[PDB]
Amino acid sequence: MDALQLANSAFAVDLFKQLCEKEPLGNVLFSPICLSTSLSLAQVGAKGDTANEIGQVLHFENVKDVPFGFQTVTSDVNKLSSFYSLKLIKRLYVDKSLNLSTEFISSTKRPYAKELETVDFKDKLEETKGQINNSIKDLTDGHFENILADNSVNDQTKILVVNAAYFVGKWMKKFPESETKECPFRLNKTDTKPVQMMNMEATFCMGNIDSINCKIIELPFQNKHLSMFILLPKDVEDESTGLEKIEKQLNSESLSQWTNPSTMANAKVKLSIPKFKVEKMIDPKACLENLGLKHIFSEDTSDFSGMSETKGVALSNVIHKVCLEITEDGQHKDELNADHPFIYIIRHNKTRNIIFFGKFCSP
């Protein structure tokens, strides 16, 4: 569990850094827990170098019973769907010709409940595409109507990972709408872009790392099941400086320390954060390959013998789309004015797993 969360956060940072490299000025957002869950299911069906490469990239080296750890996180998180406007949908769609192993199905029935599905890519492509789109549409309460668009599924698709996640935030402490106003978001020391800036004064856990010149704040969502942590540089900087700080200072160990409330003090904070909605689709294949995942995607070299005796099977495509919407809806003294670029995570407080991981670079 603790071993698992640490694996998940380490992988989350690795992937985030890959995404940052790909889009340095972009508003990165992904759901690392979804990708870690999906890929751990694939690892159950893999063997040899395929299984070991997944484990290494996902940092599973020191984790015993990975599927049961995910069982618990998925359980916790599925209950949260009923309280929060939140869905984290993970599906592994496999073609009929895979003839899934019985041991694989029974091994994964409880830990990855509903996440594994057989479909007919080979002989019924357009029907299957409609079925997947519509199934994901209902699973995400109407939010993602066409998950398969701007990516491909084709009649040779063997295994398909779909992650689709959304969260419409509801704070523990609501922002007063009347104090939300348009401000120049400071892109860097000279350049500006307009943004709806939310404002309140309330008590929050806040950290204040002088050494890395960083303020961290915990902003709890209703009933404290999820919190957003904002890591905000104390001074506006050039984008090169900021991207170098991420590159050199951010690691899973440091992130965990910086965002640990045990290091944080209760403060009355004059708080300013942007009102924002971010929706991002990513192609993880390229990034996963960079991390070391080579055997996964090769029909010639992959060993998926734990799930299928069919030849030429591999992870065909990974789809990963996330939408996050942040609004007003909901004796130390300090200021947190996030009107310049910051990193944010949304943590499941119980397990400490990162649910969403992002960079806010511009409105």
Side-chain angles (χ1 to χ4, degrees), residues 171 205-207 215-221 226-232 255-256 258-261 264 342-349 354 356 358:
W171 298 113
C205 295
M206 197 171 159
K215 283 162 159 182
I216 307 88
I217 189 163
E218 177 194 11
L219 303 175
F221 291 102
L226 301 175
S227 283
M228 180 184 286
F229 290 84
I230 294 179
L231 308 287
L232 182 74
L255 181 60
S256 170
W258 303 335
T259 58
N260 182 197
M264 294 178 80
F342 58 89
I343 288 164
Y344 63 89
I345 61 173
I346 296 171
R347 268 208 138 102
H348 177 53
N349 296 317
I354 305 159
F356 302 103

PDB file of all heavy atoms in Angstrom, residues 171 205-207 215-221 226-232 255-256 258-261 264 342-349 352 354 356 358, unseen atoms left out:
ATOM      1  N   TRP A 171     -15.028  22.656  -3.367  1.00  0.00           N
ATOM      2  CA  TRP A 171     -14.135  22.946  -2.258  1.00  0.00           C
ATOM      3  C   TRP A 171     -14.800  22.654  -0.921  1.00  0.00           C
ATOM      4  O   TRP A 171     -16.025  22.615  -0.824  1.00  0.00           O
ATOM      5  CB  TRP A 171     -13.723  24.426  -2.278  1.00  0.00           C
ATOM      6  CG  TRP A 171     -12.971  24.845  -3.488  1.00  0.00           C
ATOM      7  CD1 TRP A 171     -13.397  25.705  -4.461  1.00  0.00           C
ATOM      8  CD2 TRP A 171     -11.657  24.420  -3.872  1.00  0.00           C
ATOM      9  NE1 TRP A 171     -12.429  25.846  -5.423  1.00  0.00           N
ATOM     10  CE2 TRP A 171     -11.352  25.065  -5.091  1.00  0.00           C
ATOM     11  CE3 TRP A 171     -10.713  23.548  -3.310  1.00  0.00           C
ATOM     12  CZ2 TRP A 171     -10.136  24.882  -5.753  1.00  0.00           C
ATOM     13  CZ3 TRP A 171      -9.497  23.364  -3.970  1.00  0.00           C
ATOM     14  CH2 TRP A 171      -9.224  24.026  -5.183  1.00  0.00           C
ATOM     15  N   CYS A 205      -3.743  24.775   5.570  1.00  0.00           N
ATOM     16  CA  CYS A 205      -2.386  24.270   5.762  1.00  0.00           C
ATOM     17  C   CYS A 205      -1.528  24.879   4.692  1.00  0.00           C
ATOM     18  O   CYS A 205      -1.879  24.855   3.517  1.00  0.00           O
ATOM     19  CB  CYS A 205      -2.329  22.749   5.644  1.00  0.00           C
ATOM     20  SG  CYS A 205      -3.243  22.001   6.955  1.00  0.00           S
ATOM     21  N   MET A 206      -0.405  25.459   5.090  1.00  0.00           N
ATOM     22  CA  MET A 206       0.500  26.072   4.139  1.00  0.00           C
ATOM     23  C   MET A 206       1.954  25.793   4.485  1.00  0.00           C
ATOM     24  O   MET A 206       2.344  25.819   5.653  1.00  0.00           O
ATOM     25  CB  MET A 206       0.237  27.573   4.033  1.00  0.00           C
ATOM     26  CG  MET A 206       0.834  28.177   2.798  1.00  0.00           C
ATOM     27  SD  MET A 206       0.312  29.853   2.536  1.00  0.00           S
ATOM     28  CE  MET A 206       1.632  30.410   1.464  1.00  0.00           C
ATOM     29  N   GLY A 207       2.740  25.506   3.457  1.00  0.00           N
ATOM     30  CA  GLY A 207       4.173  25.289   3.593  1.00  0.00           C
ATOM     31  C   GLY A 207       4.905  26.440   2.933  1.00  0.00           C
ATOM     32  O   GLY A 207       4.366  27.112   2.054  1.00  0.00           O
ATOM     33  N   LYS A 215       6.203  28.381  -2.184  1.00  0.00           N
ATOM     34  CA  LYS A 215       5.081  28.266  -1.264  1.00  0.00           C
ATOM     35  C   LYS A 215       4.206  27.100  -1.709  1.00  0.00           C
ATOM     36  O   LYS A 215       3.931  26.935  -2.905  1.00  0.00           O
ATOM     37  CB  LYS A 215       4.253  29.548  -1.238  1.00  0.00           C
ATOM     38  CG  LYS A 215       4.858  30.685  -0.434  1.00  0.00           C
ATOM     39  CD  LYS A 215       4.211  32.004  -0.813  1.00  0.00           C
ATOM     40  CE  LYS A 215       4.397  33.044   0.284  1.00  0.00           C
ATOM     41  NZ  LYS A 215       3.717  34.317  -0.078  1.00  0.00           N
ATOM     42  N   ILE A 216       3.792  26.284  -0.746  1.00  0.00           N
ATOM     43  CA  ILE A 216       2.881  25.168  -0.994  1.00  0.00           C
ATOM     44  C   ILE A 216       1.650  25.379  -0.151  1.00  0.00           C
ATOM     45  O   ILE A 216       1.747  25.747   1.028  1.00  0.00           O
ATOM     46  CB  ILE A 216       3.481  23.781  -0.624  1.00  0.00           C
ATOM     47  CG1 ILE A 216       4.838  23.571  -1.302  1.00  0.00           C
ATOM     48  CG2 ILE A 216       2.526  22.659  -1.053  1.00  0.00           C
ATOM     49  CD1 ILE A 216       6.004  24.075  -0.528  1.00  0.00           C
ATOM     50  N   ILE A 217       0.490  25.154  -0.750  1.00  0.00           N
ATOM     51  CA  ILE A 217      -0.744  25.241   0.006  1.00  0.00           C
ATOM     52  C   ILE A 217      -1.611  24.017  -0.244  1.00  0.00           C
ATOM     53  O   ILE A 217      -1.697  23.521  -1.375  1.00  0.00           O
ATOM     54  CB  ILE A 217      -1.506  26.570  -0.291  1.00  0.00           C
ATOM     55  CG1 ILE A 217      -2.687  26.744   0.675  1.00  0.00           C
ATOM     56  CG2 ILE A 217      -1.932  26.640  -1.778  1.00  0.00           C
ATOM     57  CD1 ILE A 217      -3.256  28.169   0.756  1.00  0.00           C
ATOM     58  N   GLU A 218      -2.243  23.528   0.817  1.00  0.00           N
ATOM     59  CA  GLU A 218      -3.258  22.488   0.680  1.00  0.00           C
ATOM     60  C   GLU A 218      -4.655  23.103   0.635  1.00  0.00           C
ATOM     61  O   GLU A 218      -5.111  23.717   1.608  1.00  0.00           O
ATOM     62  CB  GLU A 218      -3.189  21.476   1.832  1.00  0.00           C
ATOM     63  CG  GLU A 218      -4.284  20.428   1.735  1.00  0.00           C
ATOM     64  CD  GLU A 218      -4.471  19.606   2.991  1.00  0.00           C
ATOM     65  OE1 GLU A 218      -3.903  19.956   4.047  1.00  0.00           O
ATOM     66  OE2 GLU A 218      -5.193  18.596   2.914  1.00  0.00           O
ATOM     67  N   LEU A 219      -5.330  22.910  -0.488  1.00  0.00           N
ATOM     68  CA  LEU A 219      -6.703  23.368  -0.653  1.00  0.00           C
ATOM     69  C   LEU A 219      -7.620  22.149  -0.660  1.00  0.00           C
ATOM     70  O   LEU A 219      -7.691  21.435  -1.660  1.00  0.00           O
ATOM     71  CB  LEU A 219      -6.841  24.182  -1.950  1.00  0.00           C
ATOM     72  CG  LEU A 219      -5.931  25.405  -2.129  1.00  0.00           C
ATOM     73  CD1 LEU A 219      -6.104  26.043  -3.512  1.00  0.00           C
ATOM     74  CD2 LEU A 219      -6.163  26.446  -1.026  1.00  0.00           C
ATOM     75  N   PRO A 220      -8.302  21.872   0.472  1.00  0.00           N
ATOM     76  CA  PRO A 220      -9.098  20.653   0.556  1.00  0.00           C
ATOM     77  C   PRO A 220     -10.398  20.755  -0.222  1.00  0.00           C
ATOM     78  O   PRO A 220     -11.025  21.813  -0.238  1.00  0.00           O
ATOM     79  CB  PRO A 220      -9.394  20.526   2.063  1.00  0.00           C
ATOM     80  CG  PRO A 220      -8.490  21.555   2.742  1.00  0.00           C
ATOM     81  CD  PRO A 220      -8.367  22.638   1.726  1.00  0.00           C
ATOM     82  N   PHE A 221     -10.780  19.669  -0.887  1.00  0.00           N
ATOM     83  CA  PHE A 221     -12.098  19.574  -1.484  1.00  0.00           C
ATOM     84  C   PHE A 221     -13.080  19.100  -0.421  1.00  0.00           C
ATOM     85  O   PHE A 221     -12.658  18.637   0.633  1.00  0.00           O
ATOM     86  CB  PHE A 221     -12.071  18.646  -2.700  1.00  0.00           C
ATOM     87  CG  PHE A 221     -11.305  19.219  -3.858  1.00  0.00           C
ATOM     88  CD1 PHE A 221     -10.016  18.788  -4.139  1.00  0.00           C
ATOM     89  CD2 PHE A 221     -11.852  20.241  -4.628  1.00  0.00           C
ATOM     90  CE1 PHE A 221      -9.288  19.346  -5.200  1.00  0.00           C
ATOM     91  CE2 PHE A 221     -11.131  20.794  -5.693  1.00  0.00           C
ATOM     92  CZ  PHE A 221      -9.850  20.346  -5.966  1.00  0.00           C
ATOM     93  N   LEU A 226     -10.343  14.625  -1.183  1.00  0.00           N
ATOM     94  CA  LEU A 226      -9.272  15.055  -2.077  1.00  0.00           C
ATOM     95  C   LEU A 226      -8.810  16.443  -1.666  1.00  0.00           C
ATOM     96  O   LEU A 226      -9.606  17.241  -1.207  1.00  0.00           O
ATOM     97  CB  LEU A 226      -9.743  15.071  -3.542  1.00  0.00           C
ATOM     98  CG  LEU A 226     -10.266  13.789  -4.221  1.00  0.00           C
ATOM     99  CD1 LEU A 226     -10.792  14.082  -5.629  1.00  0.00           C
ATOM    100  CD2 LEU A 226      -9.225  12.658  -4.268  1.00  0.00           C
ATOM    101  N   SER A 227      -7.515  16.709  -1.826  1.00  0.00           N
ATOM    102  CA  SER A 227      -6.948  18.048  -1.692  1.00  0.00           C
ATOM    103  C   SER A 227      -6.136  18.378  -2.926  1.00  0.00           C
ATOM    104  O   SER A 227      -5.472  17.500  -3.491  1.00  0.00           O
ATOM    105  CB  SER A 227      -6.013  18.130  -0.490  1.00  0.00           C
ATOM    106  OG  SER A 227      -6.732  18.206   0.727  1.00  0.00           O
ATOM    107  N   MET A 228      -6.192  19.637  -3.341  1.00  0.00           N
ATOM    108  CA  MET A 228      -5.245  20.158  -4.310  1.00  0.00           C
ATOM    109  C   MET A 228      -4.077  20.782  -3.572  1.00  0.00           C
ATOM    110  O   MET A 228      -4.259  21.539  -2.623  1.00  0.00           O
ATOM    111  CB  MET A 228      -5.898  21.205  -5.213  1.00  0.00           C
ATOM    112  CG  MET A 228      -4.959  21.806  -6.267  1.00  0.00           C
ATOM    113  SD  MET A 228      -5.718  23.120  -7.246  1.00  0.00           S
ATOM    114  CE  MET A 228      -6.800  22.212  -8.321  1.00  0.00           C
ATOM    115  N   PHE A 229      -2.872  20.465  -4.015  1.00  0.00           N
ATOM    116  CA  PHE A 229      -1.690  21.130  -3.507  1.00  0.00           C
ATOM    117  C   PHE A 229      -1.180  21.996  -4.633  1.00  0.00           C
ATOM    118  O   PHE A 229      -1.015  21.526  -5.752  1.00  0.00           O
ATOM    119  CB  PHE A 229      -0.645  20.105  -3.050  1.00  0.00           C
ATOM    120  CG  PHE A 229      -1.034  19.368  -1.801  1.00  0.00           C
ATOM    121  CD1 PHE A 229      -1.857  18.243  -1.861  1.00  0.00           C
ATOM    122  CD2 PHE A 229      -0.587  19.803  -0.556  1.00  0.00           C
ATOM    123  CE1 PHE A 229      -2.231  17.565  -0.691  1.00  0.00           C
ATOM    124  CE2 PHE A 229      -0.955  19.130   0.614  1.00  0.00           C
ATOM    125  CZ  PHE A 229      -1.777  18.000   0.537  1.00  0.00           C
ATOM    126  N   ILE A 230      -0.991  23.280  -4.351  1.00  0.00           N
ATOM    127  CA  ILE A 230      -0.374  24.182  -5.304  1.00  0.00           C
ATOM    128  C   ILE A 230       1.062  24.467  -4.873  1.00  0.00           C
ATOM    129  O   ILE A 230       1.316  24.841  -3.731  1.00  0.00           O
ATOM    130  CB  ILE A 230      -1.163  25.499  -5.452  1.00  0.00           C
ATOM    131  CG1 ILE A 230      -2.538  25.219  -6.070  1.00  0.00           C
ATOM    132  CG2 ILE A 230      -0.387  26.483  -6.317  1.00  0.00           C
ATOM    133  CD1 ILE A 230      -3.434  26.462  -6.238  1.00  0.00           C
ATOM    134  N   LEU A 231       1.996  24.267  -5.789  1.00  0.00           N
ATOM    135  CA  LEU A 231       3.386  24.573  -5.536  1.00  0.00           C
ATOM    136  C   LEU A 231       3.669  25.818  -6.365  1.00  0.00           C
ATOM    137  O   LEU A 231       3.768  25.738  -7.606  1.00  0.00           O
ATOM    138  CB  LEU A 231       4.288  23.408  -5.968  1.00  0.00           C
ATOM    139  CG  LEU A 231       4.126  21.921  -5.560  1.00  0.00           C
ATOM    140  CD1 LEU A 231       4.525  21.678  -4.137  1.00  0.00           C
ATOM    141  CD2 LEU A 231       2.740  21.298  -5.824  1.00  0.00           C
ATOM    142  N   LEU A 232       3.767  26.961  -5.682  1.00  0.00           N
ATOM    143  CA  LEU A 232       3.916  28.263  -6.334  1.00  0.00           C
ATOM    144  C   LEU A 232       5.246  28.939  -5.990  1.00  0.00           C
ATOM    145  O   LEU A 232       5.512  29.210  -4.819  1.00  0.00           O
ATOM    146  CB  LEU A 232       2.762  29.185  -5.921  1.00  0.00           C
ATOM    147  CG  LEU A 232       2.686  30.587  -6.529  1.00  0.00           C
ATOM    148  CD1 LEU A 232       2.228  30.549  -8.000  1.00  0.00           C
ATOM    149  CD2 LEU A 232       1.758  31.450  -5.692  1.00  0.00           C
ATOM    150  N   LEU A 255       8.851  15.860  -3.816  1.00  0.00           N
ATOM    151  CA  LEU A 255       7.437  16.187  -3.932  1.00  0.00           C
ATOM    152  C   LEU A 255       6.675  15.751  -2.682  1.00  0.00           C
ATOM    153  O   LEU A 255       5.886  16.518  -2.126  1.00  0.00           O
ATOM    154  CB  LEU A 255       6.810  15.578  -5.188  1.00  0.00           C
ATOM    155  CG  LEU A 255       5.323  15.901  -5.404  1.00  0.00           C
ATOM    156  CD1 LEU A 255       5.089  17.406  -5.537  1.00  0.00           C
ATOM    157  CD2 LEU A 255       4.788  15.157  -6.607  1.00  0.00           C
ATOM    158  N   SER A 256       6.929  14.524  -2.241  1.00  0.00           N
ATOM    159  CA  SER A 256       6.250  13.983  -1.067  1.00  0.00           C
ATOM    160  C   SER A 256       6.533  14.805   0.194  1.00  0.00           C
ATOM    161  O   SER A 256       5.634  15.047   1.001  1.00  0.00           O
ATOM    162  CB  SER A 256       6.632  12.517  -0.865  1.00  0.00           C
ATOM    163  OG  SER A 256       6.164  12.058   0.382  1.00  0.00           O
ATOM    164  N   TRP A 258       7.584  18.110   0.212  1.00  0.00           N
ATOM    165  CA  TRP A 258       6.997  19.437   0.031  1.00  0.00           C
ATOM    166  C   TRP A 258       5.488  19.471   0.265  1.00  0.00           C
ATOM    167  O   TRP A 258       4.960  20.472   0.731  1.00  0.00           O
ATOM    168  CB  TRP A 258       7.277  20.004  -1.362  1.00  0.00           C
ATOM    169  CG  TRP A 258       8.720  20.116  -1.758  1.00  0.00           C
ATOM    170  CD1 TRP A 258       9.806  20.232  -0.935  1.00  0.00           C
ATOM    171  CD2 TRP A 258       9.225  20.159  -3.098  1.00  0.00           C
ATOM    172  NE1 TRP A 258      10.960  20.318  -1.681  1.00  0.00           N
ATOM    173  CE2 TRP A 258      10.630  20.278  -3.011  1.00  0.00           C
ATOM    174  CE3 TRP A 258       8.626  20.104  -4.364  1.00  0.00           C
ATOM    175  CZ2 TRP A 258      11.442  20.346  -4.142  1.00  0.00           C
ATOM    176  CZ3 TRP A 258       9.435  20.158  -5.483  1.00  0.00           C
ATOM    177  CH2 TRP A 258      10.828  20.274  -5.365  1.00  0.00           C
ATOM    178  N   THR A 259       4.797  18.387  -0.066  1.00  0.00           N
ATOM    179  CA  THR A 259       3.342  18.382   0.005  1.00  0.00           C
ATOM    180  C   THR A 259       2.836  17.645   1.226  1.00  0.00           C
ATOM    181  O   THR A 259       1.668  17.277   1.300  1.00  0.00           O
ATOM    182  CB  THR A 259       2.719  17.754  -1.245  1.00  0.00           C
ATOM    183  OG1 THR A 259       3.212  16.423  -1.401  1.00  0.00           O
ATOM    184  CG2 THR A 259       3.054  18.578  -2.487  1.00  0.00           C
ATOM    185  N   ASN A 260       3.725  17.425   2.181  1.00  0.00           N
ATOM    186  CA  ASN A 260       3.357  16.730   3.394  1.00  0.00           C
ATOM    187  C   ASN A 260       2.926  17.739   4.448  1.00  0.00           C
ATOM    188  O   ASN A 260       3.758  18.514   4.921  1.00  0.00           O
ATOM    189  CB  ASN A 260       4.526  15.885   3.903  1.00  0.00           C
ATOM    190  CG  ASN A 260       4.177  15.092   5.149  1.00  0.00           C
ATOM    191  OD1 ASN A 260       5.061  14.623   5.857  1.00  0.00           O
ATOM    192  ND2 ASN A 260       2.880  14.943   5.422  1.00  0.00           N
ATOM    193  N   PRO A 261       1.620  17.750   4.796  1.00  0.00           N
ATOM    194  CA  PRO A 261       1.059  18.594   5.857  1.00  0.00           C
ATOM    195  C   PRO A 261       1.793  18.553   7.205  1.00  0.00           C
ATOM    196  O   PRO A 261       1.734  19.527   7.950  1.00  0.00           O
ATOM    197  CB  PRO A 261      -0.375  18.074   5.985  1.00  0.00           C
ATOM    198  CG  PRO A 261      -0.711  17.629   4.590  1.00  0.00           C
ATOM    199  CD  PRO A 261       0.559  16.968   4.120  1.00  0.00           C
ATOM    200  N   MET A 264       3.723  21.350   7.201  1.00  0.00           N
ATOM    201  CA  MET A 264       2.907  22.522   6.891  1.00  0.00           C
ATOM    202  C   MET A 264       2.268  23.103   8.145  1.00  0.00           C
ATOM    203  O   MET A 264       1.959  22.374   9.095  1.00  0.00           O
ATOM    204  CB  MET A 264       1.842  22.169   5.847  1.00  0.00           C
ATOM    205  CG  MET A 264       2.414  21.810   4.470  1.00  0.00           C
ATOM    206  SD  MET A 264       1.160  21.338   3.246  1.00  0.00           S
ATOM    207  CE  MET A 264       0.563  22.921   2.736  1.00  0.00           C
ATOM    208  N   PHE A 342       2.346  27.669 -11.901  1.00  0.00           N
ATOM    209  CA  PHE A 342       2.484  26.781 -10.757  1.00  0.00           C
ATOM    210  C   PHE A 342       2.287  25.314 -11.143  1.00  0.00           C
ATOM    211  O   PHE A 342       1.725  25.014 -12.183  1.00  0.00           O
ATOM    212  CB  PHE A 342       1.543  27.195  -9.615  1.00  0.00           C
ATOM    213  CG  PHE A 342       0.070  27.233  -9.982  1.00  0.00           C
ATOM    214  CD1 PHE A 342      -0.729  26.091  -9.857  1.00  0.00           C
ATOM    215  CD2 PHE A 342      -0.527  28.419 -10.408  1.00  0.00           C
ATOM    216  CE1 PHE A 342      -2.085  26.113 -10.175  1.00  0.00           C
ATOM    217  CE2 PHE A 342      -1.890  28.451 -10.742  1.00  0.00           C
ATOM    218  CZ  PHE A 342      -2.671  27.304 -10.615  1.00  0.00           C
ATOM    219  N   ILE A 343       2.738  24.413 -10.285  1.00  0.00           N
ATOM    220  CA  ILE A 343       2.443  22.993 -10.424  1.00  0.00           C
ATOM    221  C   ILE A 343       1.354  22.635  -9.414  1.00  0.00           C
ATOM    222  O   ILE A 343       1.337  23.159  -8.299  1.00  0.00           O
ATOM    223  CB  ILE A 343       3.705  22.138 -10.184  1.00  0.00           C
ATOM    224  CG1 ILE A 343       4.663  22.284 -11.372  1.00  0.00           C
ATOM    225  CG2 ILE A 343       3.364  20.660  -9.974  1.00  0.00           C
ATOM    226  CD1 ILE A 343       6.088  21.806 -11.050  1.00  0.00           C
ATOM    227  N   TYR A 344       0.432  21.761  -9.811  1.00  0.00           N
ATOM    228  CA  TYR A 344      -0.588  21.314  -8.880  1.00  0.00           C
ATOM    229  C   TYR A 344      -0.778  19.810  -8.949  1.00  0.00           C
ATOM    230  O   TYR A 344      -0.568  19.190  -9.995  1.00  0.00           O
ATOM    231  CB  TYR A 344      -1.905  22.069  -9.099  1.00  0.00           C
ATOM    232  CG  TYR A 344      -2.540  21.842 -10.446  1.00  0.00           C
ATOM    233  CD1 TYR A 344      -3.430  20.780 -10.648  1.00  0.00           C
ATOM    234  CD2 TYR A 344      -2.257  22.680 -11.517  1.00  0.00           C
ATOM    235  CE1 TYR A 344      -4.015  20.566 -11.894  1.00  0.00           C
ATOM    236  CE2 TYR A 344      -2.840  22.483 -12.757  1.00  0.00           C
ATOM    237  CZ  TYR A 344      -3.713  21.426 -12.940  1.00  0.00           C
ATOM    238  OH  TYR A 344      -4.278  21.237 -14.174  1.00  0.00           O
ATOM    239  N   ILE A 345      -1.124  19.222  -7.811  1.00  0.00           N
ATOM    240  CA  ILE A 345      -1.543  17.837  -7.784  1.00  0.00           C
ATOM    241  C   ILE A 345      -2.861  17.765  -7.049  1.00  0.00           C
ATOM    242  O   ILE A 345      -3.161  18.615  -6.200  1.00  0.00           O
ATOM    243  CB  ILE A 345      -0.494  16.888  -7.129  1.00  0.00           C
ATOM    244  CG1 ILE A 345      -0.211  17.263  -5.674  1.00  0.00           C
ATOM    245  CG2 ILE A 345       0.810  16.834  -7.964  1.00  0.00           C
ATOM    246  CD1 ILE A 345       0.692  16.249  -4.955  1.00  0.00           C
ATOM    247  N   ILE A 346      -3.663  16.774  -7.385  1.00  0.00           N
ATOM    248  CA  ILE A 346      -4.847  16.467  -6.577  1.00  0.00           C
ATOM    249  C   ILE A 346      -4.602  15.081  -5.990  1.00  0.00           C
ATOM    250  O   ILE A 346      -4.458  14.102  -6.729  1.00  0.00           O
ATOM    251  CB  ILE A 346      -6.138  16.571  -7.405  1.00  0.00           C
ATOM    252  CG1 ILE A 346      -6.330  18.032  -7.860  1.00  0.00           C
ATOM    253  CG2 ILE A 346      -7.349  16.090  -6.609  1.00  0.00           C
ATOM    254  CD1 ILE A 346      -7.444  18.263  -8.876  1.00  0.00           C
ATOM    255  N   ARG A 347      -4.507  15.032  -4.666  1.00  0.00           N
ATOM    256  CA  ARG A 347      -4.167  13.828  -3.918  1.00  0.00           C
ATOM    257  C   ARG A 347      -5.390  13.225  -3.261  1.00  0.00           C
ATOM    258  O   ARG A 347      -6.214  13.945  -2.716  1.00  0.00           O
ATOM    259  CB  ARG A 347      -3.178  14.163  -2.798  1.00  0.00           C
ATOM    260  CG  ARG A 347      -1.744  14.026  -3.180  1.00  0.00           C
ATOM    261  CD  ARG A 347      -0.873  13.696  -1.977  1.00  0.00           C
ATOM    262  NE  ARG A 347       0.106  12.685  -2.373  1.00  0.00           N
ATOM    263  CZ  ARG A 347       1.384  12.911  -2.661  1.00  0.00           C
ATOM    264  NH1 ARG A 347       1.914  14.125  -2.573  1.00  0.00           N
ATOM    265  NH2 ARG A 347       2.143  11.892  -3.019  1.00  0.00           N
ATOM    266  N   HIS A 348      -5.483  11.898  -3.312  1.00  0.00           N
ATOM    267  CA  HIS A 348      -6.434  11.142  -2.514  1.00  0.00           C
ATOM    268  C   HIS A 348      -5.802  11.048  -1.129  1.00  0.00           C
ATOM    269  O   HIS A 348      -4.839  10.320  -0.932  1.00  0.00           O
ATOM    270  CB  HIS A 348      -6.658   9.762  -3.148  1.00  0.00           C
ATOM    271  CG  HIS A 348      -7.578   8.872  -2.374  1.00  0.00           C
ATOM    272  ND1 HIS A 348      -8.840   9.262  -1.979  1.00  0.00           N
ATOM    273  CD2 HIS A 348      -7.428   7.599  -1.942  1.00  0.00           C
ATOM    274  CE1 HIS A 348      -9.419   8.274  -1.322  1.00  0.00           C
ATOM    275  NE2 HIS A 348      -8.585   7.253  -1.287  1.00  0.00           N
ATOM    276  N   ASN A 349      -6.329  11.819  -0.183  1.00  0.00           N
ATOM    277  CA  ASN A 349      -5.668  12.006   1.112  1.00  0.00           C
ATOM    278  C   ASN A 349      -5.472  10.715   1.914  1.00  0.00           C
ATOM    279  O   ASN A 349      -4.430  10.530   2.540  1.00  0.00           O
ATOM    280  CB  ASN A 349      -6.398  13.063   1.949  1.00  0.00           C
ATOM    281  CG  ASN A 349      -6.366  14.453   1.306  1.00  0.00           C
ATOM    282  OD1 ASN A 349      -5.334  14.896   0.800  1.00  0.00           O
ATOM    283  ND2 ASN A 349      -7.498  15.146   1.340  1.00  0.00           N
ATOM    284  N   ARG A 352      -2.869   8.773  -0.100  1.00  0.00           N
ATOM    285  CA  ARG A 352      -1.828   9.712  -0.576  1.00  0.00           C
ATOM    286  C   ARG A 352      -1.503   9.588  -2.077  1.00  0.00           C
ATOM    287  O   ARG A 352      -0.546  10.198  -2.567  1.00  0.00           O
ATOM    288  CB  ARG A 352      -0.550   9.631   0.275  1.00  0.00           C
ATOM    289  CG  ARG A 352      -0.633  10.376   1.618  1.00  0.00           C
ATOM    290  N   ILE A 354      -1.610  10.334  -5.952  1.00  0.00           N
ATOM    291  CA  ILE A 354      -1.913  11.440  -6.860  1.00  0.00           C
ATOM    292  C   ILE A 354      -2.971  11.019  -7.895  1.00  0.00           C
ATOM    293  O   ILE A 354      -2.782  10.062  -8.657  1.00  0.00           O
ATOM    294  CB  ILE A 354      -0.631  11.987  -7.563  1.00  0.00           C
ATOM    295  CG1 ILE A 354       0.434  12.385  -6.530  1.00  0.00           C
ATOM    296  CG2 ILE A 354      -0.984  13.169  -8.464  1.00  0.00           C
ATOM    297  CD1 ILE A 354       1.838  12.435  -7.073  1.00  0.00           C
ATOM    298  N   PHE A 356      -4.798  13.558  -9.978  1.00  0.00           N
ATOM    299  CA  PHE A 356      -4.514  14.430 -11.112  1.00  0.00           C
ATOM    300  C   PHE A 356      -3.199  15.151 -10.862  1.00  0.00           C
ATOM    301  O   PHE A 356      -2.892  15.495  -9.720  1.00  0.00           O
ATOM    302  CB  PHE A 356      -5.621  15.474 -11.303  1.00  0.00           C
ATOM    303  CG  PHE A 356      -6.982  14.880 -11.501  1.00  0.00           C
ATOM    304  CD1 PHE A 356      -7.904  14.869 -10.466  1.00  0.00           C
ATOM    305  CD2 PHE A 356      -7.332  14.311 -12.715  1.00  0.00           C
ATOM    306  CE1 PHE A 356      -9.165  14.305 -10.643  1.00  0.00           C
ATOM    307  CE2 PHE A 356      -8.593  13.750 -12.907  1.00  0.00           C
ATOM    308  CZ  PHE A 356      -9.504  13.739 -11.859  1.00  0.00           C
ATOM    309  N   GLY A 358      -0.759  18.267 -12.674  1.00  0.00           N
ATOM    310  CA  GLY A 358      -0.742  19.300 -13.720  1.00  0.00           C
ATOM    311  C   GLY A 358       0.210  20.464 -13.510  1.00  0.00           C
ATOM    312  O   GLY A 358       0.785  20.629 -12.444  1.00  0.00           O
TER     313      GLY A 358
END
